[model samples]
Structure formats: structure tokens, C-alpha cells
Target chain A: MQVEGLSINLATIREQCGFAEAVDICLKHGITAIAPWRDQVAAIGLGEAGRIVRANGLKLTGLCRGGFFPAPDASGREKAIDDNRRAVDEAAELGADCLVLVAGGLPGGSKNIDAARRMVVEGIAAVLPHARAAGVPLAIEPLHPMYAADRACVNTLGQALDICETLGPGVGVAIDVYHVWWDPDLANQIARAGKMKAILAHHICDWLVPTKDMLTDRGMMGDGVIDLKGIRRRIEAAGFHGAQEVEIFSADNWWKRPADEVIATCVERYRNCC
Target chain B: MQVEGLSINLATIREQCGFAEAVDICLKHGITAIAPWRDQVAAIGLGEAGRIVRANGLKLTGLCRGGFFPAPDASGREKAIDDNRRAVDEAAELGADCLVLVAGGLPGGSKNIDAARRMVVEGIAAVLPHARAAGVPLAIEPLHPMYAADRACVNTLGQALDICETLGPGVGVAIDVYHVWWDPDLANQIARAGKMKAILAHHICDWLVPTKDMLTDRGMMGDGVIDLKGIRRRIEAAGFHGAQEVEIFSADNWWKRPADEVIATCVERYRNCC
Candidate 1:
């Protein structure tokens, strides 16, 4: 019994298995769509990973991720852009719906977020041409404001969309519930993303009440306080009905469980909760 | 020797001292303004706390909170309202510049944040008449998005300002740098808050790169990546020249240090960083 509209971001069960096994487990549980991280794709070699993706008739929702565009030095910034070009190529080869971009935070030792934001714009603009040529949509995943210092500084849907509008065509946003559910302007921004036709991916994960760790303490849907259905309704209303990719970074709970258990639970939760 | 623009939130040194001793330490450091939490005031009795404030000619930047308005039932919500009313009275008695309100998160077993926010507005409205009559201003402190679920549903300055606009006068905002520094619309919102004359309290703290704990891992000024001087300039430009209250919640670091050392560091940081 395959659950339609449900997709798994391989990081949810990343600790338990590699790319091939993660894909196998996801397929066994009837989840036909997935988003795989670059390291996971690299572990099994990109060629074989691409082969596995094609052979199984799987849907690649997005390639899990590209973007770290803000670097302290000019040479380093160029290197990051070069790497993103490769990521766009990989996503193109693997037939991903989009290449997720996690905009890196303050380039080492800098407190100027505004400058960093400008660097992000410049970096994305540098890569936009290649992404457009390769026919891969670039999805800017605006991380939660909590990660503004160390992770992605693009912390809101509106901010990401502004970049998309600036870069023009071939660039959009990956609306992750974990990062954006708390936003007061969420519905408006999601609607705006829809109007721009920029909604490339929808990532799902619950925010635990006492989120023990910032990076790896995401809850399963229905387990926390997020209005999962409400958010989905808004996203769907905005016109993008792509896979609701389940992306949990649970170090304490789900990560320790068996991959099969996790996959089955994801299926169960997707039906009951999402 | 007095640090003219510096104020200390007692919670910054709560682990080291009670209400009286914290004030004494701040006074010794030539810091004449302070913000004390309800428990700290209660520990010394409100009357004594008031007496201490009067004797020292201290300025109370704000009473360290009011507003946890969401609850599972009508009675629970009423209880929160009643509690806030008392908090208003306490602030009035303490002669606090305003009553800082941390808009509570979703009710237990509930996933509706919009509803929770409505409840916050309702809760503030329920207490506003008394707050106004008592000459206490309600300063809504929009917590960071990370705290949207467990601590505050009102997670942005703009959202808090919207409520202030809805509720009308005697309600303003407490802009804490740790929370609002990551906001893309910060400067614009700060200027807007200025237009409305709604900037009440300006709290200061740095956001550590690797934030270890969600609640108590706030860094001292200059120890982290926040653009303190930049934010302060905006607040001042926004027509607020009030004391920049230092509020840190470092359980492992500052909380363990001597209150004198912490207070001194705050003074030093206020001069050099903020």
C-alpha cells in the first residue's frame, strides 16, 4: 500500500543506513519518492546512485542540498560557487526536481548579517546561470532564525523569494515546516511563493516542545505543536502539491531505531498526522 | 564611574544572587537600573524589593515578564489572565518602566499557534484596563522563532506590533537583540516601532554560534556574533534612548560566575561592545 504524496528525505534515517540501503528500505515501505543528501549520494558513488534512482522508477523530490555561498574570502566564495555548479550537475543527472540551497551563515568572524545576505545574493546569482542551463530548479531552503549565525542565514520564505525575484527564473524556495512554521507571515509568503511559481519542495518535521538540541532534535509530525495540516492546506492552496518530504534530524529518538521501523512509522504518521 | 546607559536584568546573575544582592552588585558597579524576575522579587518580598528600589533611586527597566496567556481550558486561561493582572500590579508597585510580556506558546495538547496568538491578544486585552489604571505599560517581547512553540507564540517584533496596533495604546514592545537580531526586517520594523512610539524596553544579549541550550545558552555581549552597536544605533534612531538592559541566560558560564564579575563584565561589554 503505497502512500501517495509522501516522500522521505534520506537524512531522517541517515544514521541507520547509506544511500542504497536507505533507498531500499524506503522502497520496501512503499515510499517511492526521496531526497538524498550529497554525502549519501557520494558514499555509494554518484554514478551508481543515479543508476539506483533510475532503475527503481523513483521520484527524486530534491537533491539534499547545495549552497554555502557566503565565504570569508573571495577565493573561498568562488570555490563554493564552483561546488554548487557541480551540485546542479549532479541534481540534473539524478533527475531531481530541485537542488536545495542552504545559504551559509556569517563568513568566519563577521557579525554583519546584512553583508552576508548580500554575499548570498551574489553567490546565488553566480550559480543561477548554470542551474538554468542544466534545467534544475534551485530551491533556497530558508533555515530557522536560530541557525542564522552558524547555518543558513536566509531565515524566512519572503527573504528567499526576494532572492529568487532578484536572480529571476530557475530559482525558487524549499518551504520546510521546521524552519518556517513559526513565521507570522507564513501563509502570506507561501501564497506569494505560489504566485511566483517558486514552491519547489515541502519538508516536514515536528518541533519538539523542549527541543533538546538545535541541530538534531526534530520531532515526527503530530508529535509536536505544529499545525501540520493547516500548513499543508496553505501550501496546496498556493498551488504546489509536490511530495511532503519527511525530514527528521532526531538524534535521540528516531535516529536510534531500526530503519524499517522508522520508515513504517513515517508511513503511519503521514496518514494519521500529516 | 556610573555606566549611564547600562541596566542589568537580574536573571543574568540570578544563580549568584537574590533580588537585594543582585541590586547591590549592580549598584556597586555604578549600574543604577535593573530588571528583576517575579521570583526574584518574591524571594525578597515585593515590599522589600520596592523599598530597595526606592532607597537606591534605581530605575526598573522592566519587570522580567508577564504573559503566558494560552491554556487548554477556559479556567486555565482565566488563571493566566489573573496572574498577569497581578504582574501588572507588581510592575506598578516596583515603578518599572514597563511590564515585559513574553507571549506564551500553544496550549497543552493544542497545535494551533494562530489561536494561541489570538489568546495572547485576548489575554493582554483582559489585563490592559488594570495596567493602564495602575500606570503600568505592557511591553510585548516577541521571543525568537525557536521559542514559538514552548515559550512564545508571538515570535517577531512585527507580529507583536500588530497586536499592539490591534489593542491600541499603553501597549508597546521590548526589543531584545538576541531575538530580533536575526530578523531580515529588523531595521524597518524598529523604525516602524518608532513611528508608533511603541518601543518600550531594549534588552541586550549576544547569540552564541553553537548555542548549546535553547533556554539558557545566551551569550554575553561581544562574546558572540550579534551586531550590538549596530542594533543599539537603530533603537536610538527609533526614538528610544532608554537604558540598554543586559539580559543573559548562560547557565554554564555567567550564571556560575560571581555576580560581581558578571556585573562588571556587563558594564565592560556595555561600554565596549554595545
Candidate 2:
């Protein structure tokens, strides 16, 4: 009953448990793959977290995330770059496949997305050498356009790939279905990502139609409108057969469920839907 | 006291008034152009609506909307096409600059966005002859990616322009700032749109940080993160010096305000911000 190609992002059960407990639940489900947020690792101390991953023989699909590159001032931007280097260090320590980057949105009160985007590229570039030294692939996760203002300005795979191309090697992309399923150019961009060897991670979830909350209302697989199997086919067709990580931030629903039930549902859905 | 290059989508003040009252408020404010929803026209009778537009010399920047082309069944699809044809007639009668198309989302119980997108293109093609014959331009308004599942599968200026290119003349694009402002390729696409002479209408609004409700939490101009002036400059640079139509759908804020206050704020923001 072991799930092979499915990875659980601990944020999916973030409200329910911390690093160890989330890992325990994932283990009980015979799921040995998990992606944990940096906060969770810090909460339990990264040493103990790394020990658990080692003892349990768990596969780290990726470290939760590490990009918020834009800032109002030079000092702030430098601080972000320095912090991302630490993030890469943590990912390297955990043996995580990649360090996902959510390119930060508009800096402070400014409305200049282009400027913020430039900062993201520069920040990633600044952190690239450290990530390369650490052997951690930086996966630039292009957040949805809805988050283009406050969360992340890198809102498309093409845009993310453009950044990756500019940054050169050791920088790639984390393709999350929720943020990218709506893209008209998705099929093409994904194939292009494969061609550039830039597909670093594949994340899965459904986009609920009502999408009640801007930040936390993501549906479990098969519970919404995303064409999961088709997208999987395209991704696989692009020659990346890596684990498809399950990441849902449903504050009102899944977050309230028993960890076992949530993990169980993810397994069933991963089998049938995705 | 006259606003030369500004227009208001009736929905901006929709909750405050119907067709006649909306027009009256616009006229009183020295605003001579607007885009009205078909429902507003129907509520006041299109006959009177047309008379009002003609009598006051009011310019119809574009009709509010006319696309939801995808459907579960062929019958439903045909119904949508017929309805779009009637929308063309209405826009033609109102002397609207174009009929805006919000290209619909997935059909009932379907996850095929590519299929839905194809339907949108085919539906537009089906109705192109009538729209051309009626002398009404069809402006495909590429909605934000957030609305792709249930609103419009055509979610980028480039995607919409691709459709326009395929459909040829009598079809163009409605560049809504709130929707396309987040686009990384926005500048190039706007220039590309201009090069094609396909910039049909310009809709204005802002992208609020922490957009509370997906459908109705749109910010008024200058109230959020969108660079209204910059986008306006780009649109103008692209050779589209047409009316910039104010279109906000704020359920909690602007929608609940007094019509005069809302219209006044739009004028101020249009002048200062956009």
C-alpha cells in the first residue's frame, strides 16, 4: 500500500501538526515522501528533523519555499539574499531535491511589478552560487496572478522559465497545478521547461471554483476543476517522472480533518484522480 | 469640467442605479462615455437605452459582456451562440465600440480547460459573421487567470490575441488593467495588440492586496497595487488612445457607496492615478 509517486507538502497539514507529527502521519500512510516548510523544521530544530528523515528513509520532494526577494531598500534586499543562502543550506542538509522559491511581489508601497520582478531575478542570481555550492536546485515557483500583487510577481511558467534562463544553471521551476492549471500556454511552457531541463518539482492540488479564501482555500484532488490526469500526462510526456507533490492549504476543510484521514484521502485521490 | 478620455462601465455603479440613472449620473458628471451590461439595457428596455445613448450623444465604449460560450451540451452551446448574436444586435443598436466577451469557464462537471478554450474560439468564429454583418466589433476581454476555471479560459492578452489572429477582423481585445496588469509580457503584448490594430477597449480597475472575495473585491483605481498610470502610458504608447473605462466590482466597498460619490472618486482617480 506504499504510494510511490506522491509527496505530501506538510503545509497541507500545517495547522494540524508540526514537522515530526506530520511526518509520523505521512509514514503511517506508507508515504515516505514529504515536503516540509522551513518554519516546521525550525520549530523542531533542523538537526532532529534531519535525523527523522534519515531514520525513516523519507524522500524530500522539496523544502517548503524560500523566495521573497524584493524589498524597498538595498539593506532589505541584501538581507533577503543572505536569508535565501541559509534556506539553501537547510535544503542541502535535508537532502531535499530542490529549494522552492516564491518570487516576492511588489516591494512595500510600490506598484512597480517589473521592478519587483527584477529584484526577484537579482536575488535568485545573488543566491545562485551558494545554492550551487550546496548542490540544491533553486525551483522558482510562479505563483498565480491573483497573488501577483501581495504574494509573488512571478506568475507564469514562461515568466519563471525566463527568469531561470536569465539566472543560468542550478535555477529551475516548481510546477504547481493550482497556480498554473489556468495557463493557456501551460502545455507549451511545461514542455519548454523540460527542454531546458528546468523542471525541478511538480506539485499537485485542485483549484476550487468559488475559491472562498485568497490564501487558504484549496480543494483536495478530484474535488475541483483542475484536469489533473491530463496535466500529469503532459508533465510526464515532457520527460520528468519525478514525484508529484500534494500541497493543499484548505484552512476550513482539510486543515480541520484528522491527519490520518487527510493523508488517507490524499493517497486515494493520488491513486484515482492524479 | 469635462473628462475627455474616461468612460465608466455601468457595473462600477451598478448596485446604485439602473441604465437611465447610471447614464444620468455619468452625464451630470460631464462623463460622456460608458459600457453597460445587457441586463441593465433589458431592465430599462433597450429601446429607451438606445434613445438615451442617442439623445444625450453618449458614446458606448463597449457593451459590458457577451461571452460564456462553453457548455455541457451542444444545445446549450448553440443557445450561447444565439444569445451572443443577440448581444451583437444590442451592441449594434447602441452603437457600441465593441461587444466585450468574457470567454466562459469549464462546462458543467468538466475539467477540460483546453476543450473549453477551443469552444470559446469556435463560438467566437461561429458568431463572427453576424457580428461583422451587424457592424459590431467583438472584444475578447482576457480575464485574470484566477477566473480561468469558471469565468474565462482565455486568460492572457497573448492568448486572446492568438484567438483574434485566428478569427481575423471584426474581433479584437478589451485590455482590462485589472486583469492584464500582472502579465510579465504585458508591454510586449500591448504593443503586439496595437500592431495588429486589435486594441478594441480599455477597462480600468486595480488589484487589491488580500483580494477578499474573488468575484467582487476589485479595488477602485489608485486604491490598490496596479500601476494605473504606467499601464495607461503603455496602452497609449501602443496607439490605443481610446477611452479608459472604469470597471469595478466591489461588493463590500464601492458597490455600497452612493452613485455620485463613486462616480466622483472615479473621476478623481482617473485624473490623478490613471
lDDT of 1 by residue, B106-198 (tens): 898898888898899999999999999999999999999998998899999999899999999999999999889999999999999999999
lDDT of 2: 0.93
* Per-residue alpha-carbon lDDT of candidate 2 for residues A120-234, written as tens digits (9 for 90 to 100): 9999999999999999999999998889988899999999999888889999999999999999999999999989999888999899987888789999999999989999998
Candidate 1 residue B135 Cα shift, in angstroms, is: 0.5
For each candidate, give its TM-score against the true structure: 0.99, 0.99
Per-candidate Cα RMSD to the true structure, in Å, reads 0.9, 1.0
Candidate 1 docking classification: high
Question: How many clashes show up per model?
Answer: 0, 0
Per-residue alpha-carbon lDDT of candidate 1 for residues A1-274, written as tens digits (9 for 90 to 100)? 7879999999999999999999999989888999999999988999999999899989999998899988889999999999999999999999999999999999989999999999999999999999999999999999999999988999999999999999899999999999999999998999999999999999998988888898999999988878899999999999988899999999889999999999999998898888
Q: Show where candidate 1 strays beyond 4 Å.
A: none
Taken over the whole model, the C-alpha lDDT of each candidate is: 0.93, 0.93
* Candidate 2 residue B64 C-alpha distance from true site, Å: 1.5
Top DockQ: which candidate number? Answer: 1
- Per-model TM-score of chain B: 0.99, 0.98
Interface RMSD of 2: 1.0
